[PDB]
Amino acid sequence: IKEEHTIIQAEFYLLPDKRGEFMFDFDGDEIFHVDIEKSETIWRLEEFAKFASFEAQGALANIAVDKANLDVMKERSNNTPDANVAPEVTVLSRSPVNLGEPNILICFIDKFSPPVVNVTWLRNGRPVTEGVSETVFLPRDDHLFRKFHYLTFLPSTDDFYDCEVDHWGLEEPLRKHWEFEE
Amino acid sequence: KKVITAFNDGLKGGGGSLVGGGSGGGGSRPWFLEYCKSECHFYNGTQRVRLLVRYFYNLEENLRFDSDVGEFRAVTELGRPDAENWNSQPEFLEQKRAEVDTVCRHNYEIFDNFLVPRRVEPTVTVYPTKTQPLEHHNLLVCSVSDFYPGNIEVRWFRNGKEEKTGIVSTGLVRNGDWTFQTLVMLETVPQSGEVYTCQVEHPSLTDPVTVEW
């Protein structure tokens, strides 16, 4: 046969937020990323950990270089910034929805930069803070980013959900609505 | 336990600047981003590999290292100083040129043990959808979810006759957690005898999966 694949090492440092990131991508999915502040390798799926390892220190070293390089670029360009690029937001369920069967809602945030966003899951208009998770900023084919936010839920006709996303490129927060629909 | 290797980042140098690049915005909160993507392209496992390093400053890709070239090449004027500087450093150039081997091929062999062979069989289900009085064209839904890899084939049939028209799909949907899903819908006005069928083919299966309605 033929095994066509792409592996990507994506890294960045952002100002003025002073935030960095280092991750590995396999065919569009995250393999792992390194928690810069803890110097630890975080696998996207727990099962991956028993098949390999990565010295987190290598990512921190790279981030330090990206940080130094950012200053050179800011100087080289006379601190000339660009426009913020607002994201597209989509909310969908992970699996077919059946009343009373645990499921997961996905809030897909796409095509934006800089890689920073505020996200809030709302259930019946109120913020949900338990049973939620998110990915780091994932690379696209171009210069923009995407991200996934997740919410565990129990399908019911009495509820409705929203994924509220705010980004420096948006005039006002973007609230994407989702409701069960047999 | 095999250790995944990372790509080495070169240090940039200053001493010069460019005449006002460009914004395309203004008023917005200023931000500055140094972003690098080192891409390993496997055309057939380790047999044929191309390394492509891409540097971005804010919204602009400005520098590139294509293993087939063997040197850095500016994409915009903002990356030219780095190309010239790094291309004049034989030691650094040799290190970059070797990464298609010390990083790309090295890491593939590791991932070939668990990512390349990952297989999750899809769950196929068929069901109608409208508002009761179909009025216009009716809609039949073939739901295929929870699968991996992304390569999949979903075909509709009208009495063994593959419908090549009236298809409405979400396309391949990536869930972000190493699973995919898709909905392939057929616009058609039912007729008892006239049976519709959804056939699904995927590399995790041995034989196609069919569902009638």
Side-chain angles (χ1 to χ4, degrees):
Chain A
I1 320 176
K2 191 172 181 285
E3 288 292 346
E4 289 176 40
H5 305 289
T6 298
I7 279 170
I8 296 176
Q9 174 176 298
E11 61 188 273
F12 71 72
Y13 186 70
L14 170 75
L15 269 176
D17 311 67
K18 292 185 176 180
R19 301 296 178 185
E21 182 184 293
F22 183 108
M23 65 88 77
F24 255 58
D25 172 305
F26 180 86
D27 292 349
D29 293 319
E30 177 190 349
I31 307 183
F32 71 90
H33 70 263
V34 173
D35 180 319
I36 305 303
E37 314 302 288
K38 307 179 187 178
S39 185
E40 71 179 326
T41 302
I42 311 296
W43 303 91
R44 183 62 181 80
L45 300 185
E46 185 178 299
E47 63 192 71
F48 294 166
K50 63 179 178 294
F51 295 91
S53 66
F54 177 74
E55 173 171 46
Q57 285 299 96
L60 303 196
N62 274 40
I63 299 306
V65 175
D66 293 318
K67 181 178 178 307
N69 287 345
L70 181 50
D71 290 330
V72 167
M73 300 307 286
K74 286 185 59 177
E75 179 182 62
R76 181 179 305 169
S77 64
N78 193 49
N79 309 301
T80 301
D82 296 343
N84 285 269
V85 182
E88 289 194 316
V89 178
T90 305
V91 178
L92 62 164
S93 65
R94 170 171 188 280
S95 300
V97 185
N98 298 294
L99 300 180
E101 285 174 52
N103 208 310
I104 293 177
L105 279 188
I106 301 167
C107 182
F108 177 58
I109 306 171
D110 199 12
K111 311 171 187 172
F112 62 94
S113 199
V116 267
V117 286
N118 286 332
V119 179
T120 300
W121 278 110
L122 297 186
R123 172 152 49 219
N124 299 321
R126 284 163 276 300
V128 182
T129 62
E130 298 301 315
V132 300
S133 63
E134 65 191 71
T135 64
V136 293
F137 300 89
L138 313 176
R140 275 167 50 72
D141 278 20
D142 47 23
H143 55 109
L144 303 169
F145 299 87
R146 61 192 165 97
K147 195 178 198 296
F148 290 85
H149 274 256
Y150 303 101
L151 166 69
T152 297
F153 77 113
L154 182 49
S156 156
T157 54
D158 304 325
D159 306 319
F160 74 83
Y161 300 79
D162 295 294
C163 180
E164 181 149 3
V165 176
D166 200 13
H167 180 82
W168 293 117
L170 293 166
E171 303 175 56
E172 59 182 53
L174 198 57
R175 181 170 177 172
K176 271 310 185 78
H177 190 266
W178 188 92
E179 64 185 305
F180 170 72
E181 56 190 309
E182 49 94 2
Chain B
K1 203 180 181 189
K2 289 296 183 178
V3 180
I4 291 151
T5 52
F7 294 86
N8 182 78
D9 297 335
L11 258 176
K12 296 178 188 181
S17 64
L18 297 189
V19 182
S23 179
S28 300
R29 188 198 62 138
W31 56 283
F32 309 93
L33 176 73
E34 170 72 353
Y35 172 40
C36 182
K37 286 189 298 177
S38 297
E39 318 173 348
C40 294
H41 295 263
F42 304 97
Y43 291 97
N44 178 22
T46 60
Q47 297 293 328
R48 314 167 49 56
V49 186
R50 173 156 169 282
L51 165 55
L52 186 65
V53 181
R54 309 168 67 187
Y55 283 86
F56 304 77
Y57 173 57
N58 298 328
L59 305 168
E60 170 187 303
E61 181 164 8
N62 67 65
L63 183 70
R64 207 172 274 159
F65 180 92
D66 178 342
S67 62
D68 290 324
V69 179
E71 298 200 304
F72 291 87
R73 287 286 176 271
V75 179
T76 66
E77 293 310 303
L78 205 51
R80 193 180 289 296
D82 306 310
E84 306 188 338
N85 166 24
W86 296 342
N87 285 339
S88 72
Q89 288 180 52
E91 310 292 69
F92 182 52
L93 271 179
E94 282 321 307
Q95 166 195 276
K96 298 308 301 175
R97 288 165 177 166
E99 291 179 325
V100 195
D101 293 309
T102 62
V103 183
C104 289
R105 293 193 158 90
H106 174 78
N107 296 326
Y108 187 87
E109 300 181 327
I110 292 160
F111 301 134
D112 183 53
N113 285 318
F114 66 113
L115 304 184
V116 171
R118 181 180 162 78
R119 298 273 183 287
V120 179
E121 286 174 34
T123 298
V124 190
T125 292
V126 175
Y127 64 82
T129 301
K130 286 271 63 285
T131 58
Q132 299 178 301
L134 51 67
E135 297 300 301
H136 53 60
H137 62 298
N138 194 298
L139 193 61
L140 198 53
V141 181
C142 188
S143 170
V144 185
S145 66
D146 197 30
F147 65 86
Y148 189 99
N151 314 290
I152 192 159
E153 287 303 307
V154 182
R155 297 185 180 73
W156 269 110
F157 292 81
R158 197 181 194 180
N159 294 300
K161 308 181 291 66
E162 185 179 316
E163 285 289 67
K164 278 183 173 300
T165 309
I167 298 295
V168 180
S169 171
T170 52
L172 188 58
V173 174
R174 181 184 297 276
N175 297 320
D177 62 356
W178 293 75
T179 64
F180 292 97
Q181 65 174 298
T182 186
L183 294 185
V184 184
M185 300 169 258
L186 172 57
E187 311 179 314
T188 51
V189 181
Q191 288 166 50
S192 59
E194 183 182 62
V195 63
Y196 306 102
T197 305
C198 185
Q199 168 183 278
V200 175
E201 292 171 296
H202 180 266
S204 69
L205 306 170
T206 47
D207 320 311
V209 168
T210 69
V211 180
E212 305 173 304
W213 187 93

